Every structure is written in C-alpha cells, then in structure tokens.
Amino acid sequence: SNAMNDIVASTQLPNTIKTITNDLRKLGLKKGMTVIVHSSLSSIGWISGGAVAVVEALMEVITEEGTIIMPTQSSDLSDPKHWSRPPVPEEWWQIIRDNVPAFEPHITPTRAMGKVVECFRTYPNVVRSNHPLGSFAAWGRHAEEITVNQSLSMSLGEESPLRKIYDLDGYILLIGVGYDSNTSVGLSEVRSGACELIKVGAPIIENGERVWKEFVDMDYDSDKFVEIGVEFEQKGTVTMGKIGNAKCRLMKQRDIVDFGTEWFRK
Template sequence: MNQNPMEKKGVLKEYIADLSRCFNSLGIRTDESLYVTGNISRLGRVRLPKEKKLEGLHSALIKIIGDEGSIFSPAASMNLCNTDIPFDAKKTPSHEMGPLAEYFRLLPNAKRSLHPFWSIAGSGKNAHLLNEVSRHAYGLGSPWTHLLDLNTRQLNFGLHPSKA
C-alpha cells in the first residue's frame, strides 16, 4: 500500500518530533557537538524511505543543537589500504560505515578530515576543525583531539560503543 505524499509528510513530521523528544530526554542541548554513528533500522519502525529517515534524524538533531552545534560522523575508507586508489576528501565514499555516515559526509556544508583511511566528516559550527589537524588519524593534533576538546558526546543508534 503506497502512502500519498501528504501522509508521508505527516509521518516525517511525527518522526522528527519523536526523535526530538528522545534527544531532549538524553539531555542533548543547544550548541552541543555530537559524534553520531549507528544503524538507522534501529530507530523504530516507521513507514518512510531510508532517505527520509536520514533527513528526519538530521532535522531532529539540528532542531536541538541549532546553528551553534556540530555533528561529526565516521567517514573511513579503509578499503584504500594497500591500493593505488587515490583519496579525494570530497569524492571518496566512506567504506562500510553505513548510510547514516554517508548521509552526513554528503551534506552540502560537510567538511572531512584528510586522513585517507580513517577520516571523520562533520557539519556545523566546529566542522572547520577537521581541516586543522595533524596528518595522523589518532593522537595529539588528530580530529579526535578536537572532539575531546569540544566535549563531544557520542550518540550510537543500535550499536554497542565498542562497535561504533
């Protein structure tokens, strides 16, 4: 059974409202930095196409963190190890990070750190910090240093933190 566009609009609006309530209950606040990972299929049963679920999740997060907040996500492309394939921060897709990570990487205002194997994508007020890092994926001066300095909160959907 196909829903008409107006019904889908109502479902999307309710989905965003439900997610916003959940994020509020977690104490997520305006101007916060979030590192978001997960499996969107774990966000409840909702009759929306994947792209609309991703759009709804992003909208709900932005509704809470506002223009002063930031969203970061994994954008690793470890499949490039031991290959001659060049890394292009704008064009190289993330590999096995899932549709949520790829959605965040492809946002029009997204930035991406330049490590060819383990990069991070981000959007929002502090995303520029991803371009002010060392050449290393981890350690002092890496994107993770900036995320720690920002007191970034990790938000995982359907994944144990050790798998995120």
C-alpha cells in the first residue's frame, strides 16, 4: 500500500541513510561502480529523509569516482494517438502536438520513474541526456560520457546511455521493482532486430524553437522483459538481498543484455 500509516506499520525501525548504506554494501554495491538504478520508495518501508536518504545512501557507497545512472523518462511528451493510460479523445491529438511544452533537460519532469528519480535528477552535478521521451540522468565519473550524444531515433539503442553502460561493464540495481522496470533490456530488443519499428513524435527545441518532431523507434514492450527476467534468474547470475522491506537485485548489465538479445532471437 502507498498509504503512509501502512508504510510506517510495515517497518520495525526507521530506514536511514546509514541503514540503507549498510544494506547496499551487503548486497554488493561498491565504491567506483557504474550502476543504473530502478526503484520504488514505498517498497523499502518508512525512511527518515525519504527519497533524499536513498540518493545520499547511493552516493555515499558509489562516490564521485563511481557513476550512478537513472532513467528520466517523460512519456507524457509522446504522441497521444497511442495513449491508453488513460487515452484521450481524438479531437485532442493535434491540439496536444501543437501545445505540449518542449523537452528541456533542466525543466521537464519524469513520469512513472518514482520519487527517487525526481529527487536524484535535481541534484547538483547530475547530468541529463537529450531525448524528449527516453532520457537518462547520471552522476559521477562517467556521467558525461554516458549521457552525451543520445540519438533521437532508437532511443534505447547503440547510440544511447544503455550502450555506454554496456561498454563500461556496468551494473543494474532493482530496488523493490521487477524486470518490467529494467530499461537495459530495451537494448536487447534493438539488438535482436525482432520487435517492430514505429513512428513516434515528441516536442523538442530545434533552432531555439519548439518543433513537434517525428522520428523512428522500437515499440518497446515491457511484458517480454518480465519473461526474460524469469528465465535469466534460472540460468544467469543475479544477486539478491533486502533494503528494508524491498527485495532487490543486483546484476551485471552485459549479462542481462546479452541474455535478452539471444532470448528475443530464440
């Protein structure tokens, strides 16, 4: 439950930066690590400091000489034709394309990324990549290298932060979330050459001016991510432990990405 008395009731003693730091280290997070993090704050139990405590815990373990990455997706900038949660009437679609504010990395909020991401993306020295729908944010040693020159088309492909993490043999940390939140599997979708290309649209700043920009991407499908996860855990290497009440998973990104790639091909 997300109701606060349920969250408090689910906890024996407060989670603090210190208890979270200790839990992260026991799980295997280390100084210098490159790690992309996916989370649910409520899954942990009651935390003194809320999202701030988790971000500060992560930074305390990883440090400046490591790199933290988080997806900072902004799907409400997408073309409303495809919307289902909820869908909007068809008479709104062109109004939306004409009026939805352009992606601006320092301004545009994330949607369905979680409070930990909203907190993290506003930290000083956090760098955001340039994609109106599928951006990422990063902090630490490789933050610039990982976020720079993201392509508009194939947002999760070979010219994405996912590929840069892959190149650096980075880790994926899932905090109280499952494989449907594992963005890195999108890179397996692209490399499989299986899933379908679709025409997508989003508002960007182009020539110092708002344009509704059309481009090409994959119709990424998170349901096959969960299937991959189930199989990956029966076969591949993944570490599991708890942060407060959250069941967490830590894994090498290259292991899951390569497994996913072969899975999609069959």
